[PDB]
Design a protein around this nucleic acid. Structure first.
Lengths: 49, 48, 120, 100, 96, 58, 54, 159
RNA sequence: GGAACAAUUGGAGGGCAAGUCUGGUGCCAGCAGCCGCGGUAAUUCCAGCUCCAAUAGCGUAUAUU
């Protein structure tokens, strides 16, 4: 029917399969608030230079 | 032939009847009897 | 000086027989320099040196490296017969047949080297 | 110390053409050593000897003067890419093309 | 069973036709009635696909089954005289 | 299911398993592989480990 | 931080530089504590010898 | 058993046979001959049956040549081995002689009819070659490496 | 010249979705899965996944020994 009535078959850019790049995720470092690094006890305070 | 196998599967599907028999014909259209008997053998195995 | 001289009784002929076998099996190096390089590379199974050679210092210097490597070396009294037993069209004074891991010539070498080991 | 670092890494020196027994302590230093040089192989003097312009003072200088420094650079920039993969410039590009 | 190595039987009902897990053995089970003794037993088919081919009241050859439901001793091997495994590899058709 | 060229011709299949069994053989033990090179002696070409002992205790 | 005893005393406290607070450090305050990078006040004679070399 | 499997795999590797079927054929024949050797040792010395059967059999075995001519004792006939038997196998003699570059190369030559023993072409690479016949192993006159026509591919690129 | 002049039979394993099903003190787990949004002249996919055995013969049932 499509070849007769000269109709292209419907084809979706959004449905045709694709080759995905997965960039290797890393995350930000741990971020800990001002008051927390204040109030915590000596043994575990953070040492920063 | 395509029609032969068509018919075969139709028979098997709507129902294998009592009896079927194969007829190899046009054997006079053969130049080498060794080729002819090899054809006989292979065809029989195909049909079995 | 050539005190490891071979004797007559078919010993010499067994040597030439295995020599021709090795020339056919291509497990044979030939002539003084190639014998020298084979025993330098230590690959030689056994080494046979002529005795009728014009002055014998060649087949006297070879047993030095034969005494180093400790390979059976043996004196044969006819270099022209070595040439014929190898199939050369030239007379050879020094021959060295090496070892491979898969042959019955190897068993022949084992017997021959045991005989020359009893000899010297 | 650089020399010893090189020697402990003599594995990666041969770019796959020769693997060594990975003799790795944590402390790559022997408490006793001496820096030496080969004298003379009188058997082989036509190629088994370094020319004057190749007689370098130091091991790392020798491996510098050999080839495949290009190949080193090549592999290093591969790993440079592979670790610049999705770390930070990537994310900044995303947030830029989101902000626009 | 009996003394034979195989048995011919009649498909009663693919009990476990209302199954949730595909490859469960109560999906793959089927009650058959072995003919000579007229006895009801149940058997396993090796695969759910072959269970789709098998229908009722077809003669079934079956045999022993030896290696979540241990105790079913038989396994169906041929139905209507055709090899289930050949159907399953799509070699032959099934005579009906 | 799909089969391969080796599983198609049984002889060449039995070729390739043997070499792969021989490459792994060197990965456990050492095989003579000919003596020193004709270029001369150039060192124990892959490492030497003084804390490595392979003597079989009787 | 919750189960923190208000009253502990190690000895780094006599020897380090504390967090303090918002008011203490003021604007460069992050409650982490400073680990000296490794420099120190060079007394004169050393600086002289160095500057001589320079 | 892993010893059996590693053993047979090693054998086919060093002599590129076709299958363990061929291997077990060689083994079953080794079993017959070593069994006959054992019953000949079950006879005692200077028993004329033992003397005649032993000399006849060792003559057969050095005549096919798998026994070394140096030793002629039933103990060594019992100490015979399948490595020597597949060394005796035809294709391995071809590879040892050097008419082919590899063992599979030589087997292909014996399949597509390039080598002859003495007079005649032999298609089977497992032919028992005797000590008297080990010499006359050469290319066919119809083989392009022997002479005659240049060959199929030579013809097709020469066309 | 392999997409062929078209090797087979068993066994074990690994990889998977805008899919399905079931269980529960949230993301976990389980079984499973040709079924997926589109699309059949479209797709070109693990591109022919891996390994063990036998190999032009082998598997399974029962009886067994």
């Amino acid at each position: 029917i499509r070849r007769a009535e000269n109709i292209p078959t419907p084809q979706n850019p959004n449905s045709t399969y694709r080759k995905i790049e997965r960039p290797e995720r890393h995350f930000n470092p741990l971020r800990v608030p001002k008051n927390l690094a204040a109030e915590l006890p000596f043994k575990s305070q953070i040492v920063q230079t | 032939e395509m029609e032969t196998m068509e018919f075969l599967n139709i028979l098997a599907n709507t129902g294998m009847p009592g009896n079927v028999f194969g007829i190899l014909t046009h054997l006079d259209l053969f130049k080498k009897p060794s080729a002819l008997k090899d054809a006989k053998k292979r065809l029989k195995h195909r049909l079995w | 000086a050539a005190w490891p001289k071979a004797e007559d009784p078919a010993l010499v002929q067994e040597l030439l027989d295995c020599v021709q076998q090795a020339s056919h099996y291509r497990q044979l190096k030939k002539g003084a320099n190639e014998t020298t390089k084979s025993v330098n590379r230590g690959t030689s199974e056994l080494v046979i040196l002529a005795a009728d050679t014009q002055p014998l210092s060649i087949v006297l210097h070879i047993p030095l490296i034969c005494e180093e490597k400790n390979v059976p070396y043996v004196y044969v009294p006819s270099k022209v017969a070595l040439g014929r037993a190898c199939g050369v069209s030239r007379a050879v004074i020094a021959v060295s047949l090496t070892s491979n891991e898969a042959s019955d010539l190897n068993s022949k070498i084992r017997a021959l080297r045991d005989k020359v080991e009893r000899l010297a | 110390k650089r020399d010893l670092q090189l020697l402990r890494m003599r594995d990666v020196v041969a770019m796959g053409k020769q693997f060594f027994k990975k003799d790795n302590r944590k402390d790559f230093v022997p408490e006793y050593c001496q820096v030496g040089t080969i004298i003379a192989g009188a058997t082989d003097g036509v190629s088994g000897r370094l020319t004057r312009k190749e007689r370098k003072r130091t091991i790392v200088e020798e491996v510098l003067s050999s080839d495949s420094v290009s190949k080193y650079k090549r592999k290093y920039h591969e790993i440079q890419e592979h670790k610049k993969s999705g770390r930070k410039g990537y994310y900044k590009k995303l947030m830029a093309a989101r902000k626009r | 069973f009996g003394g034979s190595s195989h048995a011919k039987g009649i498909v009663l009902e693919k009990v476990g036709v209302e199954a949730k897990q595909p490859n469960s053995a109560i999906r793959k089970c089927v009650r058959v009635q072995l003919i000579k003794n007229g006895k009801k037993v149940t058997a396993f088919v090796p695969n759910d696909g072959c269970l789709n081919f098998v229908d009722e009241n077809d003669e079934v050859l079956l045999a022993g089954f030896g290696r979540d439901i241990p105790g079913v001793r038989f396994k169906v091997v041929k139905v209507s005289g055709v090899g289930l495994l050949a159907l399953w590899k799509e070699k032959k058709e099934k005579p009906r | 299911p799909n089969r391969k060229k080796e599983q198609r011709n049984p002889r060449v299949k039995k070729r390739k398993k043997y070499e792969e069994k021989q490459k792994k053989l060197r990965s456990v033990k050492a095989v003579y592989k000919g003596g020193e090179g004709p270029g001369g002696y150039q060192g124990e070409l892959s490492g030497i480990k003084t804390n490595l002992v392979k003597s079989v205790k009787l | 931080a919750a189960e923190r005893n208000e009253d502990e005393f190690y000895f780094g406290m006599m020897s380090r530089k504390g967090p303090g607070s918002a008011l203490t450090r003021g604007k460069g305050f992050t409650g982490t504590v400073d680990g000296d990078r490794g420099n120190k006040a060079l007394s004169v004679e050393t600086v002289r010898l160095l500057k001589t070399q320079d | 058993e892993a010893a059996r499997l590693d053993s047979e795999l090693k054998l086919v590797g060093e002599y590129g046979l076709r299958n363990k079927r061929e291997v077990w054929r060689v083994l079953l024949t080794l079993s017959k001959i070593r069994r006959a050797a054992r019953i000949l040792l079950t006879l005692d010395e200077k028993d004329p049956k033992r003397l005649f059967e032993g000399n006849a059999l060792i003559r057969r075995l050095v005549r096919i040549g798998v026994l070394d001519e140096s030793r002629m004792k039933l103990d060594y006939v019992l100490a015979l081995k399948a490595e020597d038997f597949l060394e005796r196998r035809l294709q391995t003699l071809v590879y040892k002689l050097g008419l082919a570059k590899s063992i599979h190369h030589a087997r292909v030559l014996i399949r597509q009819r390039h080598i002859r023993v003495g007079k005649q072409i032999v298609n089977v690479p497992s032919f028992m070659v005797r000590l008297d016949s080990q010499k006359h192993i050469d290319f066919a006159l119809t083989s392009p490496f022997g002479g005659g026509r240049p060959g199929r591919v030579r013809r097709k690129k020469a066309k």
